[PDB]
Amino acid sequence: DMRPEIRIAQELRRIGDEFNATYAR
């Protein structure tokens, strides 16, 4: 799935999970 909306969502998920690992424990 190369739809930009899907690629954006997947990167936001990756970035958010990295943030979560750093600042919420």
Next chain:
Amino acid sequence: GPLGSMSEEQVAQDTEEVFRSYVFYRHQQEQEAEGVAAPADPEMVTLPLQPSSTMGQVGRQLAIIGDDINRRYDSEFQTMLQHLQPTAENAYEYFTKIATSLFESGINWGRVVALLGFGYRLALHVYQHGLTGFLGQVTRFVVDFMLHHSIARWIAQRGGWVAALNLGNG
């Protein structure tokens, strides 16, 4: 300190202030850091809330934590948003699709913060690239006024807009 005892609805209402504060402070930091390389967006230069309020400080804190980190992702989001081609007309649909995908596998604080960051980038991208649609609206105002207030009729009686080619020709 004590956490708030909150309704779903109160949190939703507070989100407006958190997000507007976040956007203001993130845009301000980026202008300071990048100078002329930072895209202008006067929608973002007003802070329509009390900065010392709890929600003001929450939004600022999230902007501060992201300051350097967020800039590392500028290149890839510029590219993805250029491919997405968001507009004022379709932004609600794309926002909803993207946010739904973000949270499909669950919620955590980082994903919430990433949602605010995406809201910021979407608002900036659409303004920065002139995708806000306002000139298109004004065009519709002009056409509608001329049709319904007899201006188009007046021009038609004089040969149509082609008659205006004579203006500026002696």
